[PDB]
């Protein structure tokens, strides 16, 4: 039973890189973070910031989440991010991803004690 905070980390955190290396980045990371396991997960974003910097967003700009909830936070600066998105050629167990590297504000839902990100909402 993964806690929610640990699941955000496994799905969203990639501090070991500054940026998406290849067009191949997404097929690889989606696989190693176990997101192609039971299904191809259709969309996922990886954040190439340290964990501290990303936990800090939980004290930045308070915004409405897309589901209308109000525990969403928008980062003040831009962050290095990679968007991973299934192509049309995508067929489980043979998940295939388009890699888009970008530098965007991130919006996360935060909860808990410690108040930390548990949900990736959007980037802008």
Please state the residue numbers annotated as binding site for substrate: 7, 10, 41-45, 66, 85
Tokens of 111: 């909860």
- Other CB atoms within a 10 A radius of the CB of residue 39 amount to 10
CA separation for the pair 101, 83 (Å, rounded): 6
Catalytic residue annotation: 12, 119
Specify binding-site residues.
7, 10, 41-45, 66, 85
């Amino acid at each position: 039973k993964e806690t929610a905070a640990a699941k955000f980390e496994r799905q969203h955190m990639d501090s070991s890189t500054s940026a998406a290396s290849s067009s191949n980045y997404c097929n690889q990371m989606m696989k190693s973070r176990n997101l192609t396991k039971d299904r191809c997960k259709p969309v996922n974003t990886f954040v190439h910031e340290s964990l501290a910097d990303v936990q800090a967003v939980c004290s930045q700009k308070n915004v409405a989440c897309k589901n209308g909830q109000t525990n969403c936070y928008q980062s003040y600066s831009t962050m290095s991010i990679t968007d991973c998105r299934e192509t049309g050629s995508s067929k489980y167990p043979n998940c295939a991803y388009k890699t888009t590297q970008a530098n965007k504000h991130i919006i996360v839902a935060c909860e808990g004690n410690p108040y930390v990100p548990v949900h990736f909402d959007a980037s802008v």
